[PDB]
Amino acid sequence: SGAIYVGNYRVVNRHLATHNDWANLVWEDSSRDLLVSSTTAQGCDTIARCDCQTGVYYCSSRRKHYPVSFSKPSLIFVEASEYYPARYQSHLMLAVGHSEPGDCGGILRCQHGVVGIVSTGGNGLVGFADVRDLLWLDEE
Ligand SMILES: Cc1cccc(N(C)C(=O)N2CC[C@H](C(N)=O)C2)c1
């Protein structure tokens, strides 16, 4: 579990969105595993606006933050899970790092701010859903 809180937005994995998230929906995209809902209180996270390929992510199944090198956002094949059939997920970045199913939500960050959130993984891989292209998170 985990979310990004920027301005009056809450960014979560679409497959973990709550009823309150769907009832206060701003935007969702199944192909990216992302959903954004509105919040009453203002958040403290800042979104990175960069092309960094190194950063640090939070792994809840180890209670640790790990430095990682990650790929550029791309269209990657993902294997079936309890939440999605085997399919191509867009704007996904891969890194080598421990990950387990309930780690989705953990933040990946660089020197500029939040880069994305854990969305996939397994066998020593960890996949991140990128948010750096969502410029509208910075306003209104
Ligand atoms: C972090 C982790 C570790 C091992 C496996 C995973 N996967 C395979 C997983 O639970 N899902 C559920 C939906 C997600 C997706 N974005 O398609 C894939 C994640």
Ligand SMILES: [Zn+2]
């Ligand atoms: Zn950066």
